[PDB]
């Protein structure tokens, strides 16, 4: 008994470890990107005397191509992009590599999960082309004079995690030098603007405040930024 168990070996994994094969790749990876180097399934698919048949099942939208001889899985993205961000929201691809043992007729399914990693391929984007605030000349210093970036009226970024989180800072305006001195954003996460010096309607009636939004990519050199203007008018 069990002398013949050598013929049941084809289609079984040629590696130890867990049954699923799990790999990660970047969103928007190019057509033909390698997803799995080598499935490590025992036996030979194709050629003149194969011991196994290999093929894909549950390959939804045909994202994955198989080369049975090399047991390699590749990305099929011609005419489209693998986009993790809205509106596509592809966070993962799961397919089955079906393996049929030619000699004994057994079928084994090998699950492959491809986890899609976010790139910082999106910049902050302001809902409006420009922003505006009116302030009374007697507003006390320390008062919040603009809250218009609240609740997605300001900048947003469709990436995930820190890649999609926004910080707001005021920049110096060479064409209105005192504007960054008169107004401040003390809490960069909210982007609310506070009055920092007393106003004087007899001296100056209008301020142009340059505000820059940035995302929070881990690498400073891969952070994206976008600029807007806030125009602040005094009233009597």
């Amino acid at each position: 008994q069990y002398d013949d168990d050598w013929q049941y070996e084809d289609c079984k994994l040629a590696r130890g470890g867990p049954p699923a094969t799990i790999v990660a790749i970047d969103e928007e990876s190019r057509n033909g990107t390698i997803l799995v180097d080598n499935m490590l399934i025992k036996g030979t698919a194709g050629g003149p005397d194969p011991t196994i048949e290999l093929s894909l099942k549950d390959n939804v939208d045909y994202w994955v191509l198989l080369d049975p001889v090399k047991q390699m899985l590749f990305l099929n993205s011609t005419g489209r992009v693998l986009d993790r961000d809205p509106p596509m929201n592809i966070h993962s691809i799961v397919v089955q590599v079906q393996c049929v043992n030619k000699k004994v007729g057994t079928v084994i399914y090998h699950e492959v999960r491809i986890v899609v990693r976010d790139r910082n391929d999106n910049s902050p984007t302001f809902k409006h082309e420009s922003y505006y605030a009116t302030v009374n000349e007697l507003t006390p210093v320390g008062t919040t004079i603009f809250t218009g970036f609240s609740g997605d009226n300001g900048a947003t970024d469709i990436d995930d995690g820190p890649n999609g989180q926004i910080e707001y800072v005021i920049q110096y305006n060479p064409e209105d030098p005192t504007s960054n001195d008169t107004f401040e954003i003390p809490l960069m996460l909210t982007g609310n603007v506070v009055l920092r010096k007393r106003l004087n309607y007899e001296d100056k009636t209008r301020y142009y405040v340059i505000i820059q939004a940035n995302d929070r990519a881990q690498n400073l050199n891969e952070r994206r930024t976008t600029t807007t203007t806030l125009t602040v008018d005094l009233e009597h």
Binding site: Y8, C11, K12, L13, P18, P19, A20, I22, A24, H91, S92, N101, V104, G105, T106, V107, I108, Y109, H110, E111, R113, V115, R117, D118, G161, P162, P186, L187, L189
Partner: protein
């Protein structure tokens, strides 16, 4: 004065996923949360959400995440879980996809029982008379089923892959009227194969 800066997570698993095998014992540590704060604030860690909370606990001061109740991949094969870290002035949270790893922990279950079949004494050698089927929800070799008779029979064989039962020797009513065979369906997991038995009654009908 310095406004507070909120803490941030540093684990690189938030960018991919966390794997936990379904055989992880309750009470075991599955990872450790890591975070920094530019003020050097001491940090308290936690988990958020109704279902996440039932499976995972977090030691507040160290960030060690551990398993509060058994996982079962056949019952739920993944979670999206939200972890929290606080410097006492604000809380921030972040989500991670947790994949549950398979082990072979199911035996096959047979279909369409009970199994019984009447065949005539003159049924020729080679004739398929019955089909048995079982399934098994584990992944891989642990979910692929083989069939056999225990012990094998001199009058019947079963195809190991397909469950087809054939006559392999001329029958004779006066010697045997009825056969009670034991059919075994096993998965093919390398280290811990699991299996299941069913009876198959074969009743021979008379002629001469």
């Amino acid at each position: 004065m310095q406004v507070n800066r909120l803490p941030f997570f540093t684990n690189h698993f938030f960018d991919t996923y966390l794997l936990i095998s379904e055989d992880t014992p309750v009470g075991s540590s599955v990872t450790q949360l890591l975070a920094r704060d530019m003020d050097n604030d001491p940090l308290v860690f936690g988990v958020s959400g109704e279902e996440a909370s039932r499976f995972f606990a977090v030691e507040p001061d160290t960030g060690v995440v551990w398993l509060r109740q058994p996982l079962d991949r056949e019952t739920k094969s993944e979670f999206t879980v939200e972890f929290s870290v606080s410097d006492h002035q604000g809380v921030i949270t972040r989500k991670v996809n947790i994949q549950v790893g398979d082990v072979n922990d199911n035996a096959p279950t047979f279909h369409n029982q009970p199994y019984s079949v009447r065949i005539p004494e003159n049924t020729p050698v080679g004739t398929p008379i019955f089909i048995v089927n079982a399934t098994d929800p584990d992944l891989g070799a642990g979910g692929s089923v083989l069939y056999s008779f225990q012990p094998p029979s001199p009058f019947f064989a079963i195809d190991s892959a397909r469950g087809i039962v054939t006559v392999i020797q001329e029958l004779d009513y006066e010697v045997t009227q009825a056969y009670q065979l034991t059919v075994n369906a096993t998965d093919q997991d390398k280290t811990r194969p699991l299996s299941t038995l069913a009876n198959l009654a074969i009743i021979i009908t008379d002629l001469e």
